[PDB]
């Protein structure tokens, strides 16, 4: 369904926040050079 668009492209949002968090955590570790 074009809801199941919405839900899957939410789950986009969440895994690509979790991108952000792990590639923050890249930043912090690579500040501990």
Supply the minimum distance, in Å, between the C-beta of residue 6 and a second copy. 5
Considering only the C-alpha atoms of the chain, give the largest distance between any 2 of them, rounded to a whole number of Å.
48
Helix boundaries (H) for the chain: 2-30
Contact string (CB under 8 A) for a second copy, positions 2-21, x = contact: xxxxx-xxx-xx-xxx-xx-
Strand intervals (E) in 1-33: none
CA 13 to CA 20: how far, in whole Å? 10
Per rule CB under 8 A, count of chain residues that contact a second copy: 25
Residues in contact with a second copy by the rule CB under 8 A: 1-6, 8-10, 12-13, 15-17, 19-20, 22-24, 26-27, 29-31, 33
């Amino acid at each position: 369904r074009x809801k199941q668009x919405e839900d899957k492209x939410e789950e986009x949002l969440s895994k690509x926040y979790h991108x952000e968090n792990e590639x923050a955590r890249x930043k912090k570790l690579x500040g501990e050079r």
